[PDB]
Amino acid sequence: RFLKVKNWETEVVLTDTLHLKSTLETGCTEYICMGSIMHPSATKDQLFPLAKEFIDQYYSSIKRFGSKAHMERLEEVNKEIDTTSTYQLKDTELIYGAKHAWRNASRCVGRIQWSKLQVFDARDCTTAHGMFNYICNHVKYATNKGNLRSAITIFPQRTDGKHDFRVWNSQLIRYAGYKQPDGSTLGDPANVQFTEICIQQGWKPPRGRFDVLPLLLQANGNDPELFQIPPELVLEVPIRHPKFEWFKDLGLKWYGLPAVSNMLLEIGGLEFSACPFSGWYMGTEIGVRDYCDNSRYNILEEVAKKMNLDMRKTSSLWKDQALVEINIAVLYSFQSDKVTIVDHHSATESFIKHMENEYRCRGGCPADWVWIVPPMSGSITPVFHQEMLNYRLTPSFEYQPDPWNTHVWK
Amino acid sequence: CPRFLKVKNWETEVVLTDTLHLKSTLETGCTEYICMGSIMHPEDVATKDQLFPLAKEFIDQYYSSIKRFGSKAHMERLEEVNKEIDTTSTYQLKDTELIYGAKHAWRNASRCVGRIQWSKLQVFDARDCTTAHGMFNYICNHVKYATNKGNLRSAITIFPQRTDGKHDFRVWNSQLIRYAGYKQPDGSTLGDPANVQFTEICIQQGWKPPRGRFDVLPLLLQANGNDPELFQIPPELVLEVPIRHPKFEWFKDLGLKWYGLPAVSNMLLEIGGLEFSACPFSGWYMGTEIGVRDYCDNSRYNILEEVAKKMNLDMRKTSSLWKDQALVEINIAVLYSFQSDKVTIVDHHSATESFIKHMENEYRCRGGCPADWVWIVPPMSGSITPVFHQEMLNYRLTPSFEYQPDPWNTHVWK
Ligand code: HEM
Ligand code: HEM
Ligand SMILES: Cc1cc(N)nc(CCc2cc(F)cc(CC[C@@H]3CCCN3)c2)c1
Ligand SMILES: Cc1cc(N)nc(CCc2cc(F)cc(CC[C@@H]3CCCN3)c2)c1
Ligand SMILES: C[C@H](O)[C@H](O)[C@H]1CNc2nc(N)[nH]c(=O)c2N1
Ligand SMILES: C[C@H](O)[C@H](O)[C@H]1CNc2nc(N)[nH]c(=O)c2N1
Ligand SMILES: [Zn+2]
């Protein structure tokens, strides 16, 4: 049945019909909502209807549903699943599938850009060296000297589960984290375990606060191999503040390119376990979560100190004030270095415009309020006031197990 | 449905196990295929047959809570209730049950961050009320008790339950204390834009409006399904706080103030299948309710622009974050003003920390704690509060507070 969503600030009401096309589970039931749970919980027989569904919607998108080309594609695919227990996507299908996995990503506030995605087909890759070459090309292309461009690189699909392609890095570019003797942590605390795996694998750590991690790449189920991304390919931004002259002295920097490399791309029942994708940052991703999460860089105290704020009571809101200044700094630094970045006001504004576009042309837009609303100043952004329906459309990006839990070494 | 559900805190890695969800009752609005977790709201009167098991379930729960389950007094209460539903199509709660039920409706309110306080609720039994004048008396006493000269105390006043649906008690006000809002001929709004409709109802009903920026609305009170009647709350019972800033001397020049007592009066209390359509309850504010929503929502008092001007902020680019900057200062002022006037208020850091402690205790002692993340996380600085990182399960337990239709939409005028 048709569902309505209201914006409580503008009184705009949209009608969702698109949800009628979803299949696999949200995690919720009529009795229990799991909207804030981060991760809720093939064969020839399972494969064809999934392939059929996908081919059907592809040919429906290019206005040739039921065509001879459509009819023959279905036959070709069925015949191929028959003999090889799988099938291969056409290039046009791969590109359509990747764009729509982004289009369907309910947790992404950046989806107004969804159809401008550069798709790199790396399905001919066979070795970690080949993966490294492809990933370098991606990074170089996507960075584009600061004028960032959205991109995805797609490695060979899963076959028997024993020969998976995986990027072991959760993101292509991240800073190392080190467990110090005294008990504290140097670098990025989120990456302490992964940093230790790289060290355990032969990586010589500079033990700095912003050491770019090496790539750990697994091809065709083999042991992963270490690679250093060439430093000229890694664009970084020193963080400074437009008024606080002392801010530069904090010694902070971040990288310009956000590139998720641990997710799984599902298209027509096919599983692409290595599909690193990248866009550009929303300022709060760095300024709020990376720098101010207690379990991350945790710099609020220091900043509030230099701001000489009253830090004895919570109700002075010293944390909130230091937080805003940090996020001003990040946006100012990127903009000053002409590195693409978006603030949470502009991004959420664009997302409301996108939703309206999608309801008009597509009959809806799956969206996860819990992730869409920014981690600071929530209700002064327009998505706070926007009701959203969340549901799962395919093609899609999914979570998968960390490779160091599933991999049986040499 | 699975016996155990786990929730993780992603900052602390603490994992909690929920069994309480097995007792969930009505719908969330969600399905296997769609989640409605961000949807704000996702005559008929229970029949004899619908009422029996709802009453039994509640009575069983009550007698379990007092460690007398299966006792003689328990079986006798069951029998008395059953006969009463049989002979009168309804039944009456004992005072003990009424108090237990109200406290648990609060305990079960998944959208409430203040529930660590739930067992400390003063319950006022107004089921002997017959007239709007009497409702007025009960509500004034509630307000005065709850206000306690600034040392606020949580309270609920419970008016007679629904009978046939044609004799409902209702407070027409959505909250006991709100400021009027006036639409002007040029399209601008004076006062609180949120209350323009209700304000015009009051004016039609005979209220003489002072037409100012902070006019306390009168009470519009309906007893026994009769037409509602207007009453002015004695102004000495309405504690207010002028808003000033500990640093910006000019902040007081904005002429802002707010009332001390948040008191919701449009919700329905369900206990044992009985429906209490008039049950105003009150607590104390979290600062952001005022500083972020009331003052800074664009469709509310919307003062961000004027605060930013007096702060001399660059307001031409959003990326200067001038809005965020002014928002923080406004919320510093609100907390500073309440604390200085010794009126109870809690900041969002303290409230959410207490809520996590509460939720952990509930998981351990009760087997769970329904919580609505979308409502629990504060409207500013979300991720620097501990609830942001906390996975939650949302489900409906009874006794409960529920939404109900606005009374002007359903009332049959006499
Ligand atoms: C182009 C600019 C983009 C912006 C500004 C943007 C913004 C964001 C933000 C702020 C998040 C939340 C991330 C987090 O909290 O960890 C997110 C999530 C996500 N984005 Fe986008 N994004 C962009 C591009 C892309 C692209 C190119 C793709 C894929 C082709 C994509 C797919 C996703 C997915 C699948 C998630 C959810 C990830 C998860 O569940 O952990 N995004 N995006
Ligand atoms: C004692 C201090 C209390 C605090 C600090 C507190 C805090 C809050 C806050 C911040 C909200 C969100 C309100 C909004 O955004 O409109 C809320 C909602 C709610 N509170 Fe509490 N509260 C308190 C007392 C109470 C009491 C005494 C009751 C009932 C007996 C109660 C029941 C509820 C309910 C049912 C909601 C959901 C309201 C809705 O859906 O509109 N609270 N509370
Ligand atoms: C494509 C893209 C664009 C954009 N602006 N941001 C992203 C996310 C980038 C990112 C970059 C990064 F370094 C780390 C993470 C992980 C965040 C954790 C893991 C899951 C829950 N939270 C994510 C991707
Ligand atoms: C008991 C209680 C304590 C507390 N701190 N806050 C509350 C809520 C008080 C309140 C006070 C108020 F003035 C308005 C509201 C509801 C505002 C909007 C209208 C539609 C959805 N929400 C709520 C109650
Ligand atoms: C659309 C969304 O559900 C709506 O704006 C909600 C979000 N969370 C909220 N949270 C609280 N505490 N109060 C609210 O009024 C709202 N509004
Ligand atoms: C428990 C909760 O689901 C978790 O902290 C979520 C909340 N919302 C989020 N939103 C975004 N964009 N990113 C996140 O990592 C999270 N974390
Ligand atoms: Zn749900």
Side-chain angles (χ1 to χ4, degrees), chain B residues 311-342:
Chain B
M311 289 189 63
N312 288 311
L313 304 183
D314 176 24
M315 298 171 52
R316 269 161 314 153
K317 330 111 48 63
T318 56
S319 56
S320 75
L321 304 192
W322 63 269
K323 281 191 176 172
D324 316 69
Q325 240 173 348
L327 177 71
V328 171
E329 299 301 329
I330 292 164
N331 277 276
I332 291 169
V334 160
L335 287 166
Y336 172 74
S337 300
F338 272 68
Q339 290 169 351
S340 302
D341 285 5
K342 299 170 86 71

Coordinates of all heavy atoms in Angstrom, one line a residue, chain B residues 311-342:
Chain B
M311 N 26.4 38.4 17.3 CA 27.7 37.7 17.5 C 28.7 38.1 16.5 O 29.8 37.7 16.5 CB 27.5 36.2 17.5 CG 26.8 35.6 18.7 SD 26.8 33.8 18.8 CE 28.6 33.6 18.9
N312 N 28.3 38.9 15.5 CA 29.1 39.4 14.4 C 29.7 38.2 13.6 O 30.9 38.2 13.3 CB 30.3 40.3 14.9 CG 29.8 41.6 15.3 OD1 29.0 42.3 14.6 ND2 30.1 42.0 16.5
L313 N 28.9 37.2 13.2 CA 29.3 36.1 12.5 C 29.2 36.3 11.0 O 28.3 37.0 10.6 CB 28.6 34.8 12.9 CG 28.5 34.4 14.4 CD1 27.7 33.1 14.5 CD2 29.9 34.2 14.9
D314 N 30.1 35.7 10.2 CA 29.9 35.7 8.8 C 28.8 34.8 8.4 O 28.8 33.6 8.6 CB 31.2 35.3 8.1 CG 31.1 35.1 6.6 OD1 30.2 35.8 6.0 OD2 31.8 34.4 5.9
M315 N 27.7 35.4 7.9 CA 26.5 34.6 7.6 C 26.2 34.4 6.1 O 25.1 34.1 5.7 CB 25.3 35.3 8.2 CG 25.3 35.4 9.8 SD 24.1 36.5 10.5 CE 22.6 35.8 9.7
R316 N 27.2 34.6 5.3 CA 27.0 34.4 3.8 C 27.2 33.0 3.3 O 26.6 32.6 2.4 CB 27.8 35.4 3.0 CG 27.1 36.7 2.8 CD 28.1 37.8 2.4 NE 29.2 37.8 3.4 CZ 30.4 38.2 3.1 NH1 30.7 38.7 1.9 NH2 31.4 38.1 4.0
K317 N 28.2 32.3 3.9 CA 28.4 30.9 3.6 C 28.0 30.0 4.7 O 28.2 30.3 5.9 CB 29.9 30.6 3.3 CG 30.6 31.8 2.7 CD 31.7 32.3 3.6 CE 32.5 31.1 4.3 NZ 33.3 30.4 3.3
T318 N 27.3 28.9 4.4 CA 26.9 27.9 5.4 C 28.2 27.2 6.0 O 28.1 26.8 7.2 CB 26.1 26.8 4.8 OG1 26.7 26.1 3.7 CG2 24.7 27.3 4.3
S319 N 29.3 27.2 5.3 CA 30.4 26.4 5.7 C 31.2 27.2 6.8 O 32.1 26.6 7.4 CB 31.4 26.1 4.5 OG 31.7 27.3 3.8
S320 N 30.9 28.4 7.1 CA 31.4 29.1 8.3 C 30.8 28.5 9.5 O 31.3 28.8 10.6 CB 31.1 30.6 8.2 OG 29.8 30.9 8.5
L321 N 29.7 27.8 9.4 CA 29.0 27.1 10.5 C 28.5 28.2 11.5 O 28.5 27.9 12.7 CB 29.8 26.1 11.2 CG 30.4 25.0 10.4 CD1 31.0 23.9 11.2 CD2 29.4 24.4 9.4
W322 N 28.1 29.3 11.0 CA 27.5 30.4 11.9 C 26.3 29.9 12.6 O 26.1 30.3 13.7 CB 27.2 31.6 11.1 CG 26.2 31.5 10.0 CD1 26.4 31.2 8.7 CD2 24.8 31.7 10.2 NE1 25.2 31.2 8.0 CE2 24.2 31.5 8.9 CE3 24.0 32.1 11.2 CZ2 22.8 31.7 8.7 CZ3 22.6 32.2 11.0 CH2 22.0 32.0 9.8
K323 N 25.5 29.0 12.0 CA 24.3 28.6 12.6 C 24.7 27.7 13.8 O 24.2 27.9 14.9 CB 23.4 27.8 11.7 CG 22.6 28.6 10.8 CD 21.5 27.8 10.0 CE 20.7 28.7 9.2 NZ 19.8 27.9 8.3
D324 N 25.6 26.7 13.6 CA 26.0 25.9 14.7 C 26.6 26.7 15.8 O 26.3 26.4 17.0 CB 27.1 24.9 14.1 CG 26.7 24.3 12.8 OD1 26.6 25.0 11.8 OD2 26.3 23.1 12.7
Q325 N 27.4 27.7 15.5 CA 28.1 28.5 16.5 C 27.1 29.2 17.4 O 27.2 29.2 18.6 CB 29.0 29.5 15.8 CG 30.5 29.4 16.2 CD 31.4 30.3 15.4 OE1 31.0 30.8 14.4 NE2 32.6 30.4 15.9
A326 N 26.1 29.9 16.8 CA 25.1 30.6 17.5 C 24.2 29.6 18.3 O 23.8 29.9 19.4 CB 24.2 31.4 16.6
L327 N 23.9 28.5 17.7 CA 23.1 27.4 18.4 C 23.7 27.0 19.8 O 23.0 26.9 20.8 CB 23.0 26.2 17.6 CG 22.2 25.0 18.2 CD1 20.7 25.3 18.3 CD2 22.4 23.7 17.5
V328 N 25.0 26.8 19.8 CA 25.7 26.5 21.1 C 25.5 27.6 22.1 O 25.2 27.4 23.3 CB 27.2 26.2 20.8 CG1 27.9 26.1 22.2 CG2 27.4 25.0 20.0
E329 N 25.7 28.8 21.7 CA 25.7 30.0 22.6 C 24.3 30.2 23.2 O 24.1 30.5 24.4 CB 26.1 31.3 21.9 CG 27.5 31.2 21.4 CD 28.6 31.0 22.5 OE1 28.3 31.4 23.6 OE2 29.6 30.3 22.2
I330 N 23.2 29.9 22.4 CA 21.9 30.0 22.8 C 21.6 29.0 23.9 O 20.8 29.2 24.8 CB 20.9 29.8 21.6 CG1 21.1 31.0 20.7 CG2 19.5 29.6 22.0 CD1 20.5 30.7 19.3
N331 N 22.1 27.8 23.7 CA 21.9 26.7 24.7 C 22.8 26.9 25.9 O 22.4 26.4 27.0 CB 22.2 25.4 24.0 CG 21.1 24.9 23.2 OD1 20.1 24.2 23.7 ND2 21.0 25.2 21.9
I332 N 23.9 27.6 25.8 CA 24.7 27.9 27.0 C 23.9 28.9 27.9 O 23.8 28.8 29.1 CB 26.0 28.5 26.7 CG1 26.9 27.5 26.0 CG2 26.7 29.1 27.9 CD1 28.2 28.1 25.4
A333 N 23.2 29.8 27.2 CA 22.4 30.8 27.9 C 21.2 30.2 28.6 O 20.9 30.6 29.7 CB 21.9 31.9 26.9
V334 N 20.6 29.3 28.0 CA 19.4 28.7 28.5 C 19.7 27.9 29.8 O 19.0 28.0 30.8 CB 18.7 27.7 27.5 CG1 17.8 26.7 28.2 CG2 17.9 28.6 26.5
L335 N 20.8 27.1 29.7 CA 21.2 26.4 30.9 C 21.7 27.3 32.0 O 21.5 27.0 33.2 CB 22.3 25.4 30.6 CG 21.9 24.1 29.8 CD1 23.2 23.5 29.3 CD2 21.1 23.1 30.6
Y336 N 22.4 28.4 31.7 CA 22.9 29.3 32.6 C 21.8 30.1 33.3 O 21.8 30.3 34.5 CB 23.8 30.3 31.9 CG 24.2 31.5 32.8 CD1 25.2 31.3 33.8 CD2 23.7 32.8 32.6 CE1 25.6 32.3 34.6 CE2 24.1 33.8 33.4 CZ 25.1 33.6 34.4 OH 25.5 34.7 35.2
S337 N 20.7 30.4 32.6 CA 19.6 31.1 33.1 C 18.8 30.3 34.1 O 18.4 30.8 35.2 CB 18.7 31.6 32.0 OG 19.4 32.5 31.1
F338 N 18.5 29.1 33.8 CA 17.8 28.1 34.7 C 18.5 27.9 35.9 O 18.0 27.9 37.0 CB 17.4 26.8 33.9 CG 16.1 26.9 33.2 CD1 16.0 27.7 32.0 CD2 15.0 26.1 33.6 CE1 14.8 27.7 31.3 CE2 13.8 26.1 32.9 CZ 13.7 27.0 31.8
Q339 N 19.8 27.5 35.8 CA 20.7 27.2 37.0 C 20.8 28.4 37.9 O 20.7 28.3 39.1 CB 22.0 26.7 36.5 CG 22.0 25.4 35.9 CD 23.3 25.0 35.2 OE1 24.2 25.8 35.0 NE2 23.4 23.7 34.8
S340 N 20.9 29.6 37.3 CA 21.1 30.8 38.1 C 19.8 31.2 38.9 O 19.8 31.7 40.0 CB 21.4 32.0 37.2 OG 22.6 31.8 36.5
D341 N 18.6 30.8 38.3 CA 17.4 31.1 39.0 C 16.9 29.9 39.8 O 15.8 29.8 40.3 CB 16.3 31.4 38.0 CG 16.4 32.9 37.5 OD1 17.4 33.5 37.8 OD2 15.6 33.3 36.7
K342 N 17.8 28.9 39.9 CA 17.6 27.7 40.7 C 16.3 27.0 40.3 O 15.5 26.5 41.1 CB 17.6 28.0 42.2 CG 18.9 28.6 42.6 CD 18.9 29.1 44.0 CE 19.1 28.1 45.1 NZ 20.6 27.6 45.1

